Amino acid sequence: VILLKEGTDSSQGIPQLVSNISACQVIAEAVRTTLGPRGMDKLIVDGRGKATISNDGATILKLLDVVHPAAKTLVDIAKSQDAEVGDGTTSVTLLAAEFLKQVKPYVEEGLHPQIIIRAFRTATQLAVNKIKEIAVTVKKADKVEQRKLLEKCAMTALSSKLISQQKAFFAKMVVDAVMMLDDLLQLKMIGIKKVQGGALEDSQLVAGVAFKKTFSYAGFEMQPKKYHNPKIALLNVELELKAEKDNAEIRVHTVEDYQAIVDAEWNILYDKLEKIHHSGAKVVSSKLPIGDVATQYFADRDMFCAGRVPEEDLKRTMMACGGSIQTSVNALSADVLGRCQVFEETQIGGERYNFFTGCPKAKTCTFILRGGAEQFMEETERSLHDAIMIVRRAIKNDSVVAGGGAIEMELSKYLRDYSRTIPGKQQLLIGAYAKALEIIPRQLCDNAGFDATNILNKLRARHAQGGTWYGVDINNEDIADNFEAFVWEPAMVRINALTAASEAACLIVSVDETIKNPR
Amino acid sequence: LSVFGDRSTGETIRSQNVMAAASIANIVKSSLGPVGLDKMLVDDIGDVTITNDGATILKLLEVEHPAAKVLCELADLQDKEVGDGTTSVVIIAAELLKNADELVKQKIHPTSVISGYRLACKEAVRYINENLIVNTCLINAAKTSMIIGINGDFFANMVVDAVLAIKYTDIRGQPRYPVNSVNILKAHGRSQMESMLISGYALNCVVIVNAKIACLDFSLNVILTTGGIDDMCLKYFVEAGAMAVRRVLKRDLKRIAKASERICDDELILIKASIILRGANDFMCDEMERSLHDALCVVKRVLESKSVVPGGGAVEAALSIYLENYATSMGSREQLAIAEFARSLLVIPNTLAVNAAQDSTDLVAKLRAFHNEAQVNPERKNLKWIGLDLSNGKPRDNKQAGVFEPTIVKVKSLKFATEAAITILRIDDLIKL
Amino acid sequence: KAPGFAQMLKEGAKHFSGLEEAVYRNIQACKELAQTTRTAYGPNGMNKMVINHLEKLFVTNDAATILRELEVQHPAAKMIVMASHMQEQEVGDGTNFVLVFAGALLELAEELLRIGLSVSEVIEGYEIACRKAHEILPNLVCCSAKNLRDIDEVSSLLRTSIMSKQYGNEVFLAKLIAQACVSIFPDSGHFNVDNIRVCKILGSGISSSSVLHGMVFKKETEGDVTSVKDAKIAVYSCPFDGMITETKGTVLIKTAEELMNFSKGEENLMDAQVKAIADTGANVVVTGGKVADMALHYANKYNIMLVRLNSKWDLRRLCKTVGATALPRLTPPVLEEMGHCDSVYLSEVGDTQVVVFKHEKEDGAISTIVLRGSTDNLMDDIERAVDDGVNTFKVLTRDKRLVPGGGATEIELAKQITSYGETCPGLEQYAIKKFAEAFEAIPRALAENSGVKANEVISKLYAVHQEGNKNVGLDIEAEVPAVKDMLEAGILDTYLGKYWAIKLATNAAVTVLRVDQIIMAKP
Ligand SMILES: Nc1ncnc2c1ncn2[C@@H]1O[C@H](COP(=O)(O)OP(=O)(O)O)[C@@H](O)[C@H]1O
Ligand SMILES: Nc1ncnc2c1ncn2[C@@H]1O[C@H](COP(=O)(O)OP(=O)(O)O)[C@@H](O)[C@H]1O
Ligand SMILES: Nc1ncnc2c1ncn2[C@@H]1O[C@H](COP(=O)(O)OP(=O)(O)O)[C@@H](O)[C@H]1O
């Protein structure tokens, strides 16, 4: 009758930790197959009914929104990994659950959770010291130009893909697109656009900002496209004749007043048209559509105008032209007007495309894709994005380590050999920590269809002989030196992954009870 | 399908034979070692048999399962061939099947697992033969095994002289150490220090420097008659002066034939080994009788089986490190098989540590650390050939402590355990009629 | 219909019969409360996955935070919780002591009631042993604070309080909390934990934190004024915007002409209302809501330092510190409701502009520890460890007496109480001897949470304590079950912490034992 809980759910002890360990594996299973470039995809549907298909561990975890709190901790650790690195969310979540899986039977055998944390904190620090030891700085290897090595990195990431034959052409432009930016590199600054039809060689490398230019209204044979120093207007105003937004419905009882009302409704479009010309905007780029009449206005005034621009391309032009977005047109002045050296309409692929070039704030560019279908350009959009990240990270940090699970097997060797010389309960735990590192190369083999048993066993033998960089080759079903293959990753990224992985496992292992306030 | 019986296959049948073999090991897991706990055996009648011997349990245990019966037949082969190690064989085999069943769940075929166990057992025997110790502290040997321990060197010095006096070839220059040669007795004379060694046979009978020792069995100076002597015939021996005795035991005459004082209430006819234990009370000296015969046999098994090896899990801890390093040299799907063979051997020091009421995860880790340092470099700062102290609960150099076993036990126990795991793991189907 | 229910006669309240042992049910509820908090004891305490009433996930190891979110309903358990709330007064530590020790007394009392001892004989024995404990505890005082107000002295003592609430940061927090506490001890008989207001900012980590004087606030100054010593301060929780009266004030906008006029009317209203602030001479204002863009021009027009503090509790500190109250209307020019401050200015620390309210002319005792952290959860847990550290020295403003830690006192105090229990004849020896074993539950929890065998630790402590080797406690180590001297290691507790905890834990258990039947009642 007088009950202590009264509907309050709560449990503690070994059953609580084992319960949280199984929930952590459920989150890894949702992103276990997405590991690698050739990883399997995941389909997610929301209440709207639209499906999202992608193998991005960061985007997948944001969409699941699991209610279990141990899972919320892993998902939150991925967000800190994005701000810290921007990638490695699948490795952190997949590797953190592997530490929990290996210490699961020892927890059941009565080993205290606190003793497990001392091993993770110890083995992690020993691993970080080994990463900085094995990590090599590569700036002028054999006096080779950095553009040459950076192309070998992007070619290997794009090898065995839809652009496999023309990977060299895509390799040059990817490096050139990254070289076009300033010192403060950024992935969001570069855009990638798609153009249906045509061969892969016809893919253009735009220097400035561009957009699809869905504008298909009247006003042809006029509007001289070329400009040497135009003033680019950034607006979201609709200049349609009968606009859904702007109208004038004035009911009167006089014929003479209707002539002014029909003209006054026309004056709203004309006054807005004149305010654009009043400030001297040579290029009018609007978010909303524009009517046929407004096209004839600027066509007569020696000015260009084309609406139906997405919001992203405008804001990407905001950082490029050096102006600002102005929804209105009355206060349009030089403080929001842009500048560029060459603005010209190009007919790449038959469709009209507008682009700027040589702007003062030209901190962006655009990559046009040419292929036989849309999915070839959608896969190539992200496939080249991976190569852009590889080229970016090599410029930022020159200290790197062999990818493809090569470092995970050396740390598995060092920590396993170090655990042997550690008397106490830390021996089996540091050894379990070592064996947990082998899940990264094991899934790269499973996700690639290869036999993980034969490769991981052959790979462990090569590491015992002295191979400090051998790992998994996604293309050929064999062991290959990822360091010689220019498959590199930064040393700090691998450090922050183990730190975030160990911190996540320790936080879950340090938990004993889950309390729930009924409210 | 229409058949007069049943049929079944898959992972469950290998697991059923694994879960069956694991049950037999757990029945004799806690009874491993000298401090093994006793176990009851309730027959269908209702009676109860209590003992701690793992070999005795398996012979009397009855479990209706084919896989379990293989381990019962396995223990009989190891018993008749050697007569020791049947408990460790059943436990080691069950652990190999446990780890093997886990590999089969990882898409590791049994033929790859079997090929690894055949390699791990082979190299393990080579590593064992490389780190043996041959017949060569005999005061410290029986000391560790031995209330008699209050005076270590006093009682133990008599044991090394007893076991050495019995040294005799008896076959083609074999020399062994016979068992029924020492005659341990007791007394209560004035102290526990008056116990004395005797270099001769102590005959418990009652009625001279005559070399003639007459040995006769038929019924009627040192004349022995097993069939008894009539009353009148004793008078004729007094005429010549013979020390003739009647009603001589059969077992005594065999020792007297092979061989050739004022004692409390039974004066012994000494021929001029044996040790008469003069004590204080029956409680103290009676325990000293069996305490001498026990540690005397431990020294006997060392000097008989000329090749021995350190016990206490020293072998299993060393093989766990060597086989783990040898695995990386082979590859070809044999790493996980040989690597899991290494972990399976750790059950012996893990089981003995639990039976000794100690943290097995600590002792097994401390035991592997010393053996690992032995493989890194041959320097003397690195500890070598370390075992387990079951009394104190800590590592101990069994080379000095005198804890050894015959080499054939540790060698054949791995061969029998590997052959049984292979026999059970090769099964992949069940057919009933 | 007969047979009736045994003893159930009062509002259907379950009256457990004599065979059912109604006293045992209350002991089980208090016993279960300890097991939740027994694992949160010491530096190796296991954190709790707490879910707030707002479906918010917080991870912590504080005992008081658990009981707040854990809605305790059994009134027998509420007595120990009310003792913990009383433990928060007169001292800022020992909450798990009251929970773990009281549960140990109730756990061992059930063993006595099963033998057949009366409930009153157990109560009288515990009250007697509590008196002996208060007589034995001063003799255990080994060292005391040197009373020098040195950061080295203060940081050495705070290590034990900060530890067991935030491990790893024992070194930094001991120095950061010390710098804020030593600045007020010169105010003899006026030190208050309330004066040290903790403010937390999202940042790199705890190492990036610092200590500052006055009431620091992370939100920078919205105005363009740097420093002003104007005591006239006024807080207005209403957001700065177009003024509207409490009357009708119906604004009818029809044409674009009237739109710009009344849009300019808002400019005249804010200019007229902000003008009233300067007319009173109040060049310092704090906003609770947003700020209009035109008001920023008027703030710089009359040279009024405008500040934006969006948190309500940030304003309550000012209402209780300087006295400026938060009125509901748009800038009521009421000088009576204004505050007083000797110096106010903006400051940039850690690449972050923060407002400062300090007292240059007046004596002043206000301070603030600007915490930095990447995760608000872990950063909020560091705040609770600061309060346990500041309150530790708020007790040392009283008689400065320390005792050993790590369970050293609990075995030395149990050893001495067991002696008096052996000499004292009668039935009181059972409850007195069990009162000593109730102290063993503390290092048993301290050893269990460290992953160490409990009985192996208690045997070593009683052995060395029998040799007179006092000051010997538990060595915090995952693999080593050995012990070491806590004094030389620098682990020391407070005398009043154990005094008030032993007193309230005994009374909390006695109040439960005195109860034998819980009855419901309708008003
Ligand atoms: N070309 C490649 N060859 C072999 N391994 C690769 C290659 N590219 C990436 N990997 C491996 O795939 C793993 C995941 O990479 P990535 O997808 O960038 O991170 P995440 O999977 O966390 O999003 C890395 O650990 C890396 O070793
Ligand atoms: N004195 C001792 N010290 C340490 N270990 C011992 C000692 N005597 C026996 N053992 C251990 O007990 C185990 C079982 O011995 P034994 O009973 O002869 O074989 P089984 O148990 O198979 O019948 C052996 O593996 C050995 O390591
Ligand atoms: N680092 C440490 N080493 C040994 N003992 C400690 C350590 N930290 C705390 N303790 C012990 O833990 C006990 C509880 O400390 P604390 O958590 O501050 O109070 P409570 O547990 O009541 O909240 C203290 O009595 C102290 O002796």
* Ligand nearest to the backbone CA of B310: 2
- Beta strand pairing status for A479-481 and C227-228? unpaired
- Is the Cβ atom of A35 under 6 angstroms away from ligand 1? yes
Give me the phi and psi of B382, to 5 degrees please.
Answer: -75, 125
What Å distances lie between residue A515 and A8, A70, C71, CA to CA? 8, 12, 10
Angle at C397 between CA C391 and CA C401, to 5 degrees: 95
Rounded to whole angstroms, the Cα distance separating A271 from A277 reads 10
Rounded to whole angstroms, the Cα distance separating A54 from A518 reads 38
In this structure, are residues C221 and C345 in contact, taking their beta carbons and an 8 Å threshold? no
Rounded to whole angstroms, the Cα distance separating B58 from B75 reads 8
Question: Is A1 close to C13, i.e. CB distance below 8 A?
Answer: yes
Q: Exposed, middle or buried: residue C172 (CB in 10 Å: 0-12, 13-18, 19+)?
A: middle
DSSP label of A343: B
Q: Is B33 annotated as a binding residue?
A: yes
Phi-psi map region of B158: left, alpha, beta (phi>0 left; psi -120 to 50 alpha):
alpha
Take residue C253 and report the two structure tokens written for it.
């906008």
Give how far C349 is from chain A: nearest CA, Å. Answer: 23
Which residue's C-alpha comes closest to atom 5 of ligand 3? C406
A422 touches chain C (CB under 8 A): no
Beta bridge partners of B216: B225
In this structure, are residues C344 and C356 in contact, taking their beta carbons and an 8 Å threshold? yes
Enumerate the residues of chain A whose CB falls inside 8 A of the CB of residue B108. 453
**B388: Cα separation from own chain's centroid:** 16
Nearest in space to B196 (alpha carbons), one of B210, B205, B186, B208: B186
Experimental method: cryo-EM
What Å distances lie between residue B346 and A323, A412, B128, B327, C4, CA to CA? 73, 21, 16, 17, 63
- For residue A448, the tally of other CB atoms under 10 A from its CB is 20
Beta bridge partners of A51: A45
In this structure, are residues C97 and C413 in contact, taking their beta carbons and an 8 Å threshold? no
Q: Which residues contact C42 (CB under 8 A, 6 or more apart)?
A: C164, C445, C446, C449, C450, C476
Closest in C48, C53, C448 to A519, CB measured? C53
What DSSP element (H or E) covers B216?
A: strand B213-216
Nearest in space to B335 (alpha carbons), one of A454, A420, A410, A428: A454
In this structure, are residues A443 and A32 in contact, taking their beta carbons and an 8 Å threshold? yes
CATH code for the structural domain at A210-392: 3.50.7.10
Q: Is B307 annotated as a binding residue?
A: no
Rounded to whole angstroms, the Cα distance separating C39 from C49 reads 13
Give how far A26 is from chain B: nearest CA, Å. Answer: 19
Amino acid residing at C436: A
Residue carrying structure tokens 């208060």: C134
Q: Which residues contact A298 (CB under 8 A, 6 or more apart)?
A: A223, A273, A276, A277, A284, A304, A305
Q: What is the DSSP secondary-structure string of B161-213?
A: HHHHHT-B--STT--B--STT-EEEEE--SSSS--EEESS-EE---------E
What Å distances lie between residue A503 and A80, A510, C344, C375, CA to CA? 12, 10, 42, 13
Nearest in space to C206 (alpha carbons), one of C374, C387, C386: C374
Query: Could you write out the three-class secondary structure of C397-440?
Result: CCCCCEEECCCHHHHHHHHHHHHHHHHCCCCHHHHHHHHHHHHC
Residue carrying structure tokens 């220059």: B173
Helices (H), A85-201: 89-102, 104-108, 113-134, 146-158, 167-179
Q: Which atom of ligand 3 is nearest to the CA of C489?
A: 3
Residue carrying structure tokens 């029986």: B142
Take residue B53 and report the two structure tokens written for it.
């011997």
- Beta strand pairing status for B394-397 and B386-389? antiparallel
- For residue A252, the tally of other CB atoms under 10 A from its CB is 10
Rounded to whole angstroms, the Cα distance separating A451 from A442 reads 9
Take residue C272 and report the two structure tokens written for it.
């007229």
A3 touches chain C (CB under 8 A): yes
Beta bridge partners of A345: A354
Q: Which is catalytic among the residues B294, B359, B428, B429?
A: B294
First-to-last alpha carbon distance for chain C, in angstroms, is 28
Task: For residue B169, indicate whether it is catalytic.
Answer: no
In this structure, are residues B375 and B302 in contact, taking their beta carbons and an 8 Å threshold? no
In this structure, are residues C37 and A499 in contact, taking their beta carbons and an 8 Å threshold? no
Q: Is C260 annotated as a binding residue?
A: no
Angle at A153 between CA A147 and CA A155, to 5 degrees: 100
Closest in A426, A427, A453 to B368, CB measured? A427
Q: Exposed, middle or buried: residue B155 (CB in 10 Å: 0-12, 13-18, 19+)?
A: buried
Q: What is the DSSP secondary-structure string of B1-59?
A: ---SS-EEESHHHHHHHHHHHHHHHHHTTTT-STTPPPEEEE-SSS-EEEE--HHHHHH
Q: Which is catalytic among the residues A176, A202, A246, A386?
A: A386
- Is the Cβ atom of A37 under 6 angstroms away from ligand 1? yes
Rounded to whole angstroms, the Cα distance separating A391 from A388 reads 5
Rounded to whole angstroms, the Cα distance separating B371 from A203 reads 64
Helices (H), C218-331: 256-279, 293-301, 312-321
Rounded to whole angstroms, the Cα distance separating C475 from C473 reads 7
Furthest-apart CA atoms within chain C: distance in Å: 101
Q: C303-330 b/e with 16+ CB inside 10 Å = b?
A: ebbbbbbeeeebbebbeebbebbbeeeb
Task: For residue A89, indicate whether it is catalytic.
Answer: yes
Question: Is A461 close to B336, i.e. CB distance below 8 A?
Answer: no
Which residue's C-alpha comes closest to atom 13 of ligand 3? C42
- Beta strand pairing status for C196-202 and C367-373? parallel
Task: For residue A386, indicate whether it is catalytic.
Answer: yes
Rounded to whole angstroms, the Cα distance separating B261 from B268 reads 6
In this structure, are residues C26 and C512 in contact, taking their beta carbons and an 8 Å threshold? yes
Rounded to whole angstroms, the Cα distance separating C512 from C514 reads 5
Q: Which atom of ligand 2 is nearest to the CA of B388?
A: 4
Rounded to whole angstroms, the Cα distance separating A442 from A430 reads 19
In this structure, are residues A78 and A31 in contact, taking their beta carbons and an 8 Å threshold? no
Mutate to test the interface with B, among A453, A462, A463, A479 (most CBs of B within 10 A): A453
- Is the Cβ atom of A88 under 6 angstroms away from ligand 1? yes
Beta bridge partners of A300: none
Q: Exposed, middle or buried: residue C19 (CB in 10 Å: 0-12, 13-18, 19+)?
A: exposed
- For residue B381, the tally of other CB atoms under 10 A from its CB is 6
Q: Is the peptide bond before B349 cis (omega within 30 degrees of 0)?
A: no
Give how far A452 is from chain B: nearest CA, Å. Answer: 10
Take residue C338 and report the two structure tokens written for it.
């204004």
User: Taken in order C264, C270, C272, C275, is the CA torsion positive or negative?
Assistant: negative
Give how far C11 is from chain A: nearest CA, Å. Answer: 11
What DSSP element (H or E) covers C197?
A: strand C196-202
Take residue C252 and report the two structure tokens written for it.
């009818």
In this structure, are residues B427 and B14 in contact, taking their beta carbons and an 8 Å threshold? yes
In this structure, are residues C461 and C363 in contact, taking their beta carbons and an 8 Å threshold? no
Q: B98-107 b/e with 16+ CB inside 10 Å = b?
A: bbbbebbeee
| Å from CA of A449 to ligand 1 middle | 15
Q: C203-228 b/e with 16+ CB inside 10 Å = b?
A: beebebbebbbbbbbbbebbbebeeb
Chains that touch A (3 or more CB pairs under 8 A): B, C
Residue carrying structure tokens 């029956």: B282
B273 touches chain A (CB under 8 A): no
Angle at C459 between CA C470 and CA C449, to 5 degrees: 95
Enumerate the residues of chain B whose CB falls inside 8 A of the CB of residue A420. 321, 368-369, 372
Q: Please count the CA atoms within 13 angstroms of the CA of C467 that sit on its side-chain side.
A: 8
Rounded to whole angstroms, the Cα distance separating C307 from C240 reads 12
DSSP label of C492: E
Take residue A505 and report the two structure tokens written for it.
């496992």
DSSP label of B221: -
In this structure, are residues C291 and C308 in contact, taking their beta carbons and an 8 Å threshold? yes
In this structure, are residues A97 and A24 in contact, taking their beta carbons and an 8 Å threshold? yes
* Ligand nearest to the backbone CA of C98: 3
In this structure, are residues C344 and C305 in contact, taking their beta carbons and an 8 Å threshold? yes
Furthest-apart CA atoms within chain B: distance in Å: 98
Rounded to whole angstroms, the Cα distance separating A235 from C362 reads 57
Which residues' Cβ are closer than 6 Å to ligand 2? Answer: B 32-34, 54-55, 84-88, 311-313, 348, 352, 388, 390, 403
Give how far B80 is from chain A: nearest CA, Å. Answer: 37
Q: Reduced to 3 states, what is the DSSP secondary structure of residue C502?
A: helix
Report the residue count for chain B: 433
Take residue C395 and report the two structure tokens written for it.
């007790």
B108 touches chain A (CB under 8 A): yes
Rounded to whole angstroms, the Cα distance separating A404 from C317 reads 56
DSSP label of A187: S
Beta bridge partners of C493: C403
In this structure, are residues A444 and A36 in contact, taking their beta carbons and an 8 Å threshold? yes
Question: Is A514 close to C518, i.e. CB distance below 8 A?
Answer: no
Q: Kindly tell me the number of DSSP H helices and DSSP E strands found in chain C.
A: 17, 17
- For residue C285, the tally of other CB atoms under 10 A from its CB is 24
Nearest in space to B236 (alpha carbons), one of B225, B252, B226: B225
Question: Nearest-CA residue of chain A relative to C378?
Answer: A507
Rounded to whole angstroms, the Cα distance separating B61 from A333 reads 100
C35 touches chain A (CB under 8 A): yes
User: Taken in order A289, A294, A298, A300, is the CA torsion positive or negative?
Assistant: positive
In this structure, are residues A113 and A14 in contact, taking their beta carbons and an 8 Å threshold? no
- For residue B375, the tally of other CB atoms under 10 A from its CB is 14
- For residue A469, the tally of other CB atoms under 10 A from its CB is 24
Task: For residue B87, indicate whether it is catalytic.
Answer: yes
Rounded to whole angstroms, the Cα distance separating C307 from C217 reads 10
Which residue's C-alpha comes closest to atom 17 of ligand 2? B33
Give this entry's resolution in angstroms: 3.3
Rounded to whole angstroms, the Cα distance separating B367 from B386 reads 7
Closest in A420, A454, A457 to B372, CB measured? A420
In this structure, are residues B136 and B303 in contact, taking their beta carbons and an 8 Å threshold? no
CA torsion angle for A91, A96, A97, A102 (degrees, to 10)? Answer: 120
Take residue A344 and report the two structure tokens written for it.
């010209």
Chains that touch B (3 or more CB pairs under 8 A): A
Q: A44-78 b/e with 16+ CB inside 10 Å = b?
A: eeeeeeeeeeebbbbebbeeeeeebbbbbbbbbbb
Question: Is B332 close to A457, i.e. CB distance below 8 A?
Answer: yes
Query: Could you write out the three-class secondary structure of C99-166?
Result: HHHHHHHHHHHHHHHHHCCCHHHHHHHHHHHHHHHHHHCHHHCCCCCCCCCCHHHHHHHHHHHHCCCC
What Å distances lie between residue B217 and B220, B246, C215, C515, CA to CA? 9, 10, 116, 91
Take residue C463 and report the two structure tokens written for it.
């052995």
Take residue A462 and report the two structure tokens written for it.
């090569």
In this structure, are residues A372 and A202 in contact, taking their beta carbons and an 8 Å threshold? no
Q: Which residues contact A497 (CB under 8 A, 6 or more apart)?
A: A81, A85, A88, A91, A92, A95
What Å distances lie between residue C196 and C179, C368, C383, C389, CA to CA? 11, 5, 11, 11
